[PDB]
Amino acid sequence: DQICIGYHANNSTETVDTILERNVTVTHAKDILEKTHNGKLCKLNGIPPLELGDCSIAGWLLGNPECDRLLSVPEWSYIMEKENPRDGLCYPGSFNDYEELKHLLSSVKHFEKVKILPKDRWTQHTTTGGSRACAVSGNPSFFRNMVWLTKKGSNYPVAKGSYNNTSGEQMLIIWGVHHPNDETEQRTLYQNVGTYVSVGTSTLNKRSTPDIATRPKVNGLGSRMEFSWTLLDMWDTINFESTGNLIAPEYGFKISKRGSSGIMKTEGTLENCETKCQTPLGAINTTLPFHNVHPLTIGECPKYVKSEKLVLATGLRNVPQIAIAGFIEGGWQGMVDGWYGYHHSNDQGSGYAADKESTQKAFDGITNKVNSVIEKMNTQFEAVGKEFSNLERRLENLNKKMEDGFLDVWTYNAELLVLMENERTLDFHDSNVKNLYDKVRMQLRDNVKELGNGCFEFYHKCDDECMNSVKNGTYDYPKYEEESKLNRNE
Amino acid sequence: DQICIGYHANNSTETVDTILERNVTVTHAKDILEKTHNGKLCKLNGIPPLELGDCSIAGWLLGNPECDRLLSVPEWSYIMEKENPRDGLCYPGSFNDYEELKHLLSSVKHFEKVKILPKDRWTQHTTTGGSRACAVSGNPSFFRNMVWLTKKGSNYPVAKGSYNNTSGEQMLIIWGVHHPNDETEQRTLYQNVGTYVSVGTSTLNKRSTPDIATRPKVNGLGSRMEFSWTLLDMWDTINFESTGNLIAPEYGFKISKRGSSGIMKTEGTLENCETKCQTPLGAINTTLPFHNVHPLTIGECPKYVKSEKLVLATGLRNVPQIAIAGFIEGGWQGMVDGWYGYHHSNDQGSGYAADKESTQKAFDGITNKVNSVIEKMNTQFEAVGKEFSNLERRLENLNKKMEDGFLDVWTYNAELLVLMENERTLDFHDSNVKNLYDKVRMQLRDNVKELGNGCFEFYHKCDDECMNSVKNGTYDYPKYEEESKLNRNE
Amino acid sequence: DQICIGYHANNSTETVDTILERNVTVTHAKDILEKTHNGKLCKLNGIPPLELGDCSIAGWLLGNPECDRLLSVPEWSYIMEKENPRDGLCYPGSFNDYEELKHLLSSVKHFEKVKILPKDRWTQHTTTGGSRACAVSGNPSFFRNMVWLTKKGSNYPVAKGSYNNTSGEQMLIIWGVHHPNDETEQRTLYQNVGTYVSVGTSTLNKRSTPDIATRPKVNGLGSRMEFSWTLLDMWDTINFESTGNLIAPEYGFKISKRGSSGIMKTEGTLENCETKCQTPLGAINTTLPFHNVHPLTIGECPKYVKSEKLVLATGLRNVPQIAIAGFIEGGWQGMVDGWYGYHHSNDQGSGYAADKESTQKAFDGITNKVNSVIEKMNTQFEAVGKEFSNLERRLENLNKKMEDGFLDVWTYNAELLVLMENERTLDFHDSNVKNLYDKVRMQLRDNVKELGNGCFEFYHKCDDECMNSVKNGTYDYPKYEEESKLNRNE
């Protein structure tokens, strides 16, 4: 009559890494790193994004003629742009504080276009100017949301305009200044030389003067256009004055909603799906705390690490080999209803079992460990992407250094944490088996023989009931004391 | 005659958290998170703060007539300001590089004022100008630290002024330029159009031109004032030249004492009390390494984390349930002078005791662990909080992201460290008790009998000397070898 | 006969610190912090650096007459500059976007100088002007890379220049503007007043106007020169137009190598050695993951920490003490070929041995632990120094905060990891010894007597063959069952 204590084995292949051993085969393991995506650009929280196509933000806001499908645009979750868009400023020039404008646009999610200065109010100036830089069907055209003011007859009277913000929210306004190529152009389009453009609000004051010089030809023109923007607050007034070289606004963009968004630089197209975290390669649907798909993500996404394998050991070491011996010689492939268990070989029968209390305690501990590792990582909505000009390289280097510093910190911490936790779990399982063996030995005392292969041989004739008794935890030592003593001495 | 080994239990109700278990009762515990504050704005290192009240830094530095209390400010420890101060620039305008000026004023103390260009030296100009915005008792007035130069008679001669810095330290100088509303104002105040303001030092060269345009009315005026500042070095000269629109300074600001300070935005008042670390809600007086009062602190303060509980286990589990028995089935309540100890029962009266060597070793170990966790944190003076304009949103986002990332790193590290150390301590105590049990068993050998509940019953008569020897560690096996063997056989 | 189980001891005095104890002497230990440098500056990847002597970057790029040793400069690995160079702008002035230029030079390893606007092309102007500030041998001179244009006779025609970039790479061009001290100087140098300087490329468009004012005397002059730079792209034209006050370029700097470099502030010369990582005090040659030599490093360097001692415990505890006893009364000094082993004493002699399996397993575990700690740190090329101007103090403070935060995080993590790992390995060794003792006891069963000091006394006659059978894990218990039985009961 023998009783043996052991653990459980299977046909698993997955391997984990500990701080002392590498490539250790375990029974059950949990992957806490996500490596897959759907490869498609989908909606964020059920709202389709804004697809600029071949247009740029400046071209969309200014009203580039090759972007007329973007005039009235619905609700958006984020903006999709190309790395090198083709349809931007049709007329060669520049845009002041472009990056700040893009950063502001990353938190809007809806604009409403309001006609603040109609084109018919300029009754003392010509408002039908155009250029071949952005022409439609051959005939010259211009930006749709802007007005080019030239001379009427041989006179250019002082141009004045005003607007009071009675719309309901903040309103973005854009204006421009034209830099000619020679004095002949200046006198042909604005009569007099030595002009200025003055813009004034409650908290703004700007005066600009055109620059006339020969420049290299871009899109066939030696002239330029410089654009500036401002934010007008509620119940505030904006004033425009000009003697020449003014590209007036006709529309203003009031902010309808506000929230969290970003700019994704992709060359793909929207397709029908819905997710919660978006990457340029695809979308992520997971509950794990780590991923290694792409550094630039928008939404509520797991932490990004430079790792290829992060596996937490959830089960026992898989020694496949085992008269049936116990935990000294290896694991057991017979018993399948528990982690730690018994095997009895009495006359009534020979069979496996599984201790319930120890297995439940170990299961609770391991599950609590996994939940502590996973559910302690704070996740927040973020748009990890910023844009800097060619004269702000130091700030870009600063941002990059911060990002890589955090990446290395998190990578090192995650790898080391996984290694030590795996070691501790593997030690914990052996400790539990040894504790069960010691408990049985202490409770059951001298009436037996310790075969030393990991299990016990009784001296009396223990029937089934005594086997359940020793498994139960309540074993009557005095009952068999006399009978066991007789055979033990002989 | 029997001897039992066990541990200590009391009526404590403290609770800690481990990596495998939650809500575990312990005998003693230490809180390493501070969650309390005085509730008062104190004096840092004895020096009282600078209380601006309803004033701004610009108002204090320029001499707003309402803020006539702060004309003789003494030494300060930190600056207290309001989120939206009321008395700032009475005459509408702007202040260039305002945030850099505030950042400089952070690491300055005491501060002295020296008259450099007395108002009585401008003998060829008028100096009694004023406005109704900065009015005292109804009559018009102006800033106290600045002079408004206006034409005298019907002429405005070229205005020149030089100052050599022989004070003894670096100096702060502020000047301004006036932007009128119409040309009639310009001719009434300065008699000529097309003026300039030129400022020159050894490392500075600035030329500014007035802007005349119609603007929205702020405080009843359409005109504006633009203010600029510079830092004059020792033995360096500053030159002012102007044809019009010059607001000259009369007082320069010498830096008197340097150090470390900051700006705190609070709607509070100073009260008689002292501290060493300050928070906008109150003062912190603690030595613990972590706190969760407020993220914006001035001084040398513990690390800020987003947690509500950080408790370290410095004791044993509280399993208070014991024919005395030992450590197998629970702790004792009679032991009041040790952690691990003995209970002895013989013919000369039973009683408790306490093993001193093991208890002392464990106490020293736990003390070293707590001191290692606490004393390896670096605490340096810092003042969390900076200011950014409305055109620097990207820099503000960068600062916010950096602070949030560090906060997340520290929170995660602290929680995981506490959990792992709690698990290790709770295993350490069990290992110590089992070590004591094994040592006693090895000493006593076959002369005794084990009972399985944690203690031994002898096979001879073991009086107080015998049992003290067992506790002492010097137990004589040969002395009772014959006596104990005789009883064991039968 | 007698067998004993023990561990190794030696004469080492290396001490390590754990989380529970301090100053624990160990047999072997490994230092993972580097503290040694050669105290010399030398080549990075074989290329000698660019030693600027007493010159500065601006003085080198503009051609200071006292910097004529750098007119033709070969390839470099990094740049060495003094903190306060004596030789800079000989003519007093400024240099716009200097820090951006230095950052650009922090990623270029070779320049090629190309003559783009020959000095003899200006046939309508005088090009021989020079000043006493940049004097050579007592005669007035000027920069060697720039041309000072001045009126010929009594006429200053419009000056026009152009250059088309057909060189083959990106190019750097620097121009200047002159600010005189009085109208007399302007009239004597350029005849006319009301002057502009215009520079134009396909992206850049700049117009500047001279300022005439009385300024403090620097280097004996009250005039200034302001320099600006631009990056011309391939197949792009740059145009210069001027009516006066133009300091034209004569040379352009084409990028020829491109790579990763940096600027180091030092005060020494260049020696003959080679290194992969460089610090201002010396070079580092190590494979360890941490160092405390200097924070400002250039190259591929280990992490910087503020610790003074980081030692990992590789060997076991040194407890020098003692037939002879076992592992409870100290470690054996006579064992030299292993970590854990046996001592045997029988009628054919006495001696020591070593258990190869346990020692090999422990050695592999410790090696893997050290390798895991060491080879999981990412070492990329980096340059830490960054330069900021006097108006960018907030940016500098943000940079300093990031560096301090990362330093603190890494120091805390390294120290805590070392302490915890030392405690775990010190427990690991004791666990291994106890496991060997338990294995021998289980194999030997009741045939022996456990003396209690780690030694077993046999109840029979055991020759050398039986002793070796015990050590190799193959003991035939039944064969000695009968013989050892008689001696036990007698």
Ligand SMILES: CC(=O)N[C@H]1[C@H]([C@H](O)[C@H](O)CO)O[C@@](O[C@@H]2[C@@H](O)[C@H](O)O[C@H](CO)[C@@H]2O)(C(=O)O)C[C@@H]1O
């Ligand atoms: C020298 C001086 O301070 N002169 C005026 C001053 C200026 O005219 C300028 O407006 C600076 O603020 O302005 C003050 O007076 C004004 C009114 O009294 C007048 O009715 O309307 C003016 C505007 O058209 C102007 O507001 C003022 O600021 O109240 C004071 C002083 O007379």
Ligand SMILES: CC(=O)N[C@H]1[C@H]([C@H](O)[C@H](O)CO)O[C@@](O[C@@H]2[C@@H](O)[C@H](O)O[C@H](CO)[C@@H]2O)(C(=O)O)C[C@@H]1O
């Ligand atoms: C074409 C030229 O370099 N001419 C002067 C030059 C200019 O007058 C200007 O000052 C640029 O530095 O300046 C030099 O000469 C000067 C003295 O010789 C003279 O006594 O005082 C001048 C100032 O009032 C001026 O300093 C010079 O820099 O020394 C050289 C050259 O003659």
Ligand SMILES: CC(=O)N[C@H]1[C@H]([C@H](O)[C@H](O)CO)O[C@@](O)(C(=O)O)C[C@@H]1O
């Ligand atoms: C009012 C106006 O737009 N005038 C003419 C402009 C200007 O003269 C400048 O060239 C500015 O581009 O130029 C065009 O010839 C051209 O761009 O082809 C179009 C048009 O005839």
Ligand SMILES: *[C@@H]1O[C@H](CO)[C@@H](O)[C@H](O)[C@H]1NC(C)=O
């Ligand atoms: C572990 O196994 C992988 C294959 O899955 C192999 O590439 C790697 O070299 C192994 N490492 C060790 C240390 O055996």
Ligand SMILES: *[C@@H]1O[C@H](CO)[C@@H](O)[C@H](O)[C@H]1NC(C)=O
């Ligand atoms: C703008 O309109 C608001 C009401 O919508 C009014 O109170 C305000 O006075 C107006 N602005 C001006 C300059 O009149």
Ligand SMILES: *[C@@H]1O[C@H](CO)[C@@H](O)[C@H](O)[C@H]1NC(C)=O
């Ligand atoms: C096992 O213990 C339970 C107590 O929960 C008892 O009800 C049951 O009868 C016991 N079984 C045996 C075989 O002793």
Ligand SMILES: *[C@@H]1O[C@H](CO)[C@@H](O)[C@H](O)[C@H]1NC(C)=O
């Ligand atoms: C300013 O005063 C110092 C004396 O402390 C003198 O050396 C210096 O020349 C003076 N400045 C000027 C411009 O003369």
Ligand SMILES: *[C@@H]1O[C@H](CO)[C@@H](O)[C@H](O)[C@H]1NC(C)=O
């Ligand atoms: C801080 O608390 C201690 C009590 O531990 C007290 O002695 C000390 O006076 C307190 N200091 C302040 C500034 O409140």
Ligand SMILES: *[C@@H]1O[C@H](CO)[C@@H](O)[C@H](O)[C@H]1NC(C)=O
């Ligand atoms: C107990 O140990 C102490 C050692 O400090 C010794 O002085 C004393 O005599 C010992 N007593 C007995 C009864 O062994």
Ligand SMILES: *[C@@H]1O[C@H](CO)[C@@H](O)[C@H](O)[C@H]1NC(C)=O
């Ligand atoms: C450990 O040794 C160092 C000398 O190396 C000594 O300064 C320190 O005080 C010692 N610490 C303890 C706890 O003995």
Ligand SMILES: *[C@@H]1O[C@H](CO)[C@@H](O)[C@H](O)[C@H]1NC(C)=O
């Ligand atoms: C650096 O150390 C290595 C040892 O691995 C040695 O071979 C090499 O010569 C050393 N180089 C220098 C420049 O000291």
Ligand SMILES: *[C@@H]1O[C@H](CO)[C@@H](O)[C@H](O)[C@H]1NC(C)=O
């Ligand atoms: C162990 O060594 C002994 C030598 O005494 C040898 O007889 C035996 O076969 C060895 N066993 C194994 C498994 O290597």
